[PDB]
Paper text:
We present a new class of ArMs featuring a genetically encoded noble‐metal‐binding site based on a non‐canonical thiophenol‐based amino acid, 4‐mercaptophenylalanine (pSHF), incorporated in the transcriptional regulator LmrR through stop codon suppression. We selected position V15 for incorporation, since this places pSHF inside the hydrophobic pocket at the dimer interface.
After establishing the incorporation and position of the pSHF residues in LmrR using X‐ray crystallography, we aimed to establish the binding mode of the gold ions in LmrR_V15pSHF−Au. An X‐ray crystal structure at 2.50 Å resolution was obtained via co‐crystallisation with KAuCN2, which is more water‐soluble than Au(SMe2)Cl and has been used extensively for heavy atom phasing in protein X‐ray crystallography. The crystal structure and crystallographic Fourier maps revealed the presence of one gold ion, coordinating one of the two pSHF residues in the LmrR_V15pSHF dimer (Supporting Information section 9). The gold atom is associated with a strong peak in the anomalous difference Fourier map, unambiguously establishing its identity and position in the crystal structure. In addition to the sulphur of the pSHF residue, a hydroxyl ion or water molecule appears to serve as a coordinating ligand of the gold ion, establishing a linear two‐coordination arrangement that is typical for Au(I). The gold atom is surrounded by the side chains of Asn19, Lys22, Phe93, and Met89 at a minimal distance of 4–5 Å, establishing a second coordination sphere and restricting the solvent accessibility of the gold. No clear anomalous difference peak is present near the other pSHF residue, and the electron density of this residue appears distorted and weak compared to its counterpart in the dimer, indicative of substantial conformational disorder. Although it is possible that gold is also bound to this second pSHF residue, contributing to the observed disorder, the X‐ray data is insufficient to determine this conclusively.
Numbering used by the authors:
A (entry chain B): 4 to 115
B (entry chain A): 2 to 69, 74 to 115
Write the structure that this text describes.
């Protein structure tokens, strides 16, 4: 599995987890660990790197939590731009499957 | 907000490797079939293929040979086919992870 594809996957995951609600990193890693039957330990480093991009792009935003409790954790939130990105990713990928669909279709066409 | 470069590259590659999957081919031909399969809309630029093919050839995902004008055919390699398989399986496991996230969310909501 190429690293490019791994980080693309981690991205798909994070946008999705934040879709279901604002979260923090230790929490995000834990929920995916659970939702993948132990199998998927996300890499803190890759998360951090991704959040800098996604914060850059305004796909996510962040705020401080747990300050009332003596803490200072960082909560992330999917933005509207966030939801738009995910929509266009979906639509975009669906368009690609259709192009491939049509390639396979036209192949079987010439075979006739 | 727009679709980032990395996703664009990934998409273009998805398509090219898939054209190769369906049968070894030459570049004029590849671009023509995609033009057809995208209802006229997507006539790739040669240069984009060449850029991409250099990477893929580098990584051993594709290779090339002469056919008899004597065109240059590119072929998905075995490693090629393997990678596409594992990519598919891997991405399917990711849909399940997401599936399961949405499932656990609706669970706690109750
Ligand atoms: Au595939």
């Amino acid at each position: 599995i190429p690293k490019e594809m791994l980080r693309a996957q981690t991205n798909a995951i994070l946008l999705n987890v934040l879709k279901q609600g604002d979260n923090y990193v230790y929490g995000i890693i834990k929920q995916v660990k659970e939702a993948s039957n132990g199998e998927m330990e996300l890499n803190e480093a890759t998360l951090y790197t991704i959040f800098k991009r996604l914060e850059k792009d305004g796909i996510i935003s962040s705020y401080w939590g747990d300050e009332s409790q003596g803490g200072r954790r960082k909560y992330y939130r999917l933005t509207e731009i966030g939801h738009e990105n995910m929509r266009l990713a979906f639509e975009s990928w669906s368009r690609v499957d259709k192009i491939i669909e049509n390639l396979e279709a036209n192949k079987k066409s010439e075979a006739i």
